[PDB]
Design a protein around this ligand. Structure first.
Ligand code: HEM
Ligand code: HEM
Ligand SMILES: Cc1cc(N)nc(CCc2cc(CCCN)cc(CCc3cc(C)cc(N)n3)c2)c1
Ligand SMILES: Cc1cc(N)nc(CCc2cc(CCCN)cc(CCc3cc(C)cc(N)n3)c2)c1
Ligand SMILES: [Cl-]
Ligand SMILES: [Cl-]
Lengths: 361, 362
């Protein structure tokens, strides 16, 4: 059964992949090779070309992503050759450096060996490669609450944070055969951070807010033609609202809106003053300004929606069905000012794609 | 079959309704009466109590409505007795006056005779009882674009608008037996309007913006226990964002954000300045300020979401499943600042409820 399931997934993917690459004539022999490889071994190995286009197709099919216009320019790094935790560590370090690119962020994915028997070769515990720790000790909150459980797990393994509001979590991952994961402190030279200032309000720096440059999702599974790459971290650049309207603004995150209202000099007493809405706008203005000033890539939600509109048009021009998740595509501030808000999207799941998987802690 | 379909709907509704009213003992005899009535006449007639609670349940089941906390205080006006266009006209006039209540808006529904054979007794053409006209003639846009087709239909029947940006559409409805609808101009004394000013920026009044006080939805069908009340206008008070973030801000509506940016003194040149977002906040601040200043009921989206949270809790405290449409419940500005954004809702259809129906124009 499993071999047929794998075979059927491979047939679908190879046909689609090679057609898009203008190599439909090569399909027959490739499928013959794969057919024999599956018979002998129970699996098959992607070519570098198949792997690269597969990761790109997966981004293209990611319904929740507003940034998909640039799907075909994804930088795909093949590290299916790694076998040691040192090689994994250095590959992760390298991903951070090359994706950061001194501020001119490159959308990048690093692909580690796939599951074998449903057996993971490498198991990454981080949600993102760069992320702040979070703590809670007797009513006292420090750092990022979303990181509390991973932070506790790290400190169970001998790591200790300084308990600032912005402790960088270590890389943490487990190798096949090991009962426990290893962890490695991030070199600060690798991590670009951006202090948040406001273009017109000098007092904004009193908040001492900052955020990291590059969002590198490291806990999702890439599925390509029946092969499951459970370890394959990927990054783009931020959309401003992610930082200003969610990470720094959410009550269950850094919860900064009341303090923002204070430094921009407005009262936070009455709902009808819309002070939260005003504070959100100035905070998001500050984020965009600060990233731009430091020379770190970022996009505002209006520009991003415009780019996504072109992605929709491009899909139609290429004859491809468009899929999307309206609830994630609309930005968390002024959504109705985007075209996205005013149309609907088919939330069907198309493969190749990126999927959630169970957390190991 | 229809008598069977009707019977089954009535059975379901009467049972639920009477249980909520603490009158479960009366169900048996009531259904017996309904059974005989359906056999003789092909339909049945709601008691005033059933009708009132039915309309309230329908509001309670309205998935897209953030204002449902106050479902049980709905003011239900029974006008199943009307037979003439003069009676309909005066009932509609009366609804406007009593709902407006000199600014302290009362959530109200006026219920007209139901469909018989799927044959409408009264057919209201207005989307809302109070609404601005819209025009388009050789590249020139005037008024509210959403009203263009109804406006054109009205002018087909001998009405003519002044072609301001805020012409009040006439009441327009058709009586059973008439080929064409009749129309009646709204008395201005009945219609409260609110000039939009800003609390801190005196220049805002240069925009000469205004909006009407009361949103009175008049083109939806109320379904209660298999009975179809196709004509049953209902109103609440506005949530500020409806006016400031949609009606006045939408590009396909009054499209005022560029002009707002100008009077509040910010550049509208770069997306990264978030000038649209800033203009939206100040416009919505102005709307809330202006309604409050004039003494016309309004609610901000934060307060409304807080009230809706209590509605969720009340539903759980009772034995009721909730249901909701996430895409409509989230406000169009700062949605993530509300609890609504961070949870999900079952969008199942429960009856009694309010439903869309085909426009007789268009
Ligand atoms: C190039 C810059 C990019 C931008 C600006 C961008 C923008 C976004 C944003 C804003 C979200 C979250 C939407 C929300 O929270 O409502 C998102 C989700 C997502 N993006 Fe992108 N993205 C980018 C690149 C990428 C890349 C390179 C990939 C993978 C190859 C990717 C795959 C995804 C996926 C899988 C999700 C949803 C994850 C989940 O369901 O939890 N994006 N994107
Ligand atoms: C008391 C004040 C009320 C407020 C503040 C309120 C708020 C709202 C808002 C803001 C919407 C639109 C949501 C959006 O555009 O995304 C809405 C939709 C709706 N409301 Fe309410 N509402 C109120 C009273 C009522 C009443 C009295 C009824 C009927 C008995 C009602 C039934 C509905 C229905 C049916 C819709 C959906 C209309 C459609 O699908 O086109 N609401 N409500
Ligand atoms: C409450 C809520 C609502 C919503 N619409 N979206 C979110 C998700 C924010 C989010 C969450 C996850 C993981 C969810 C499961 N643990 C991942 C992301 C990725 C955002 C992202 C990814 C990438 C690759 C680039 C970029 N600019 N942004 C963004 C949360
Ligand atoms: C594009 C768009 C998105 C969205 N979420 N919601 C809308 C609808 C706004 C709207 C539309 C209709 C009619 C839709 C079908 N033509 C009706 C309403 C009712 C608003 C309302 C009703 C009532 C009763 C009270 C109140 N405060 N507000 C509000 C449009
Ligand atoms: Cl993030
Ligand atoms: Cl409206």
């Amino acid at each position: 059964e499993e071999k047929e399931i794998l075979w059927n997934e491979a047939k679908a993917f190879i046909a689609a992949c090679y057609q898009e690459l203008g190599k439909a004539a090569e399909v027959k022999d490739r499928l013959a090779d794969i057919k024999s490889e599956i018979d002998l071994t129970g699996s098959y190995v992607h070519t570098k070309e198949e792997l690269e286009h597969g990761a790109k197709m997966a981004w293209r099919n990611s319904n929740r992503c507003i940034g998909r216009l640039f799907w075909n320019s994804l930088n795909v790094i093949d590290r299916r050759d790694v076998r040691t935790k040192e090689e994994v560590r250095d590959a992760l370090f390298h991903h951070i450096e090359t994706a950061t690119n001194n501020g001119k962020i490159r959308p990048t994915i690093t692909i580690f060996p796939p599951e074998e028997k449903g057996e993971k070769q490498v198991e990454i515990w981080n949600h993102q490669l760069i992320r702040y720790a979070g703590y809670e000790s007797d009513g006292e909150r420090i750092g990022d609450p979303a990181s509390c459980s991973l932070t506790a797990a790290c400190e169970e393994l001998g790591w200790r944070g300084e308990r600032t509001d912005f402790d960088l979590l270590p890389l943490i991952f487990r190798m096949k055969g090991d009962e426990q994961p290893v962890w490695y402190e991030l070199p600060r030279s690798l991590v670009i951070e951006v202090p948040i200032t406001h273009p017109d309000i000098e007092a904004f720096s009193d908040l001492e807010l900052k955020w990291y440059g590059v969002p590198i999702i490291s806990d999702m599974k890439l599925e390509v033609g029946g092969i499951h790459y459970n370890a394959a971290p990927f990054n783009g650049w931020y959309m401003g609202t992610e930082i200003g309207a969610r990470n720094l603004a959410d009550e269950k995150r850094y919860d900064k809106l009341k303090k923002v209202a204070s430094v921009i000099g407005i009262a936070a007493d009455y709902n009808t003053d819309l002070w939260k809405d005003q504070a959100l706008v100035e905070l998001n203005k500050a984020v965009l300004h600060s990233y731009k000033k430091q020379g770190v890539s970022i996009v505002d939600h209006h520009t991003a929606a415009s780019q996504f509109k072109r992605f929709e048009e491009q899909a139609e021009e290429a004859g491809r069905k468009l899929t999307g998740d309206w609830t994630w595509l609309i930005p968390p501030i002024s959504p109705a000012a985007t075209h996205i808000f005013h149309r609907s999207y088919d939330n069907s799941i198309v493969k190749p794609n990126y999927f959630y998987q169970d957390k190991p802690y």
